[PDB]
Design a binder for this molecule. Sequence first.
Ligand code: MYR
Ligand code: CL
Ligand code: ZN
Lengths: 21, 29
Amino acid sequence: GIVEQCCTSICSLYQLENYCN
Amino acid sequence: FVNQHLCGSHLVEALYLVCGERGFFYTPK
Ligand SMILES: *C(=O)CCCCCCCCCCCCC
Ligand SMILES: [Cl-]
Ligand SMILES: [Zn+2]
């Protein structure tokens, strides 16, 4: 989930878009 | 983990901007 993917590494805006509705 | 709590706060504000009118979901677990 987003904490494992984006708190251990910086997520780009494109990666952050994976958690949009 | 406080540093995890701190990171999540910044993730939710980034999701808010990125996702716009779609909204998002924040699921720690
Ligand atoms: C809920 O417990 C999250 C599941 C995975 C745990 C990973 C926690 C890593 C957070 C690191 C934060 C560092 C930010 C500088
Ligand atoms: Cl911080
Ligand atoms: Zn902070």
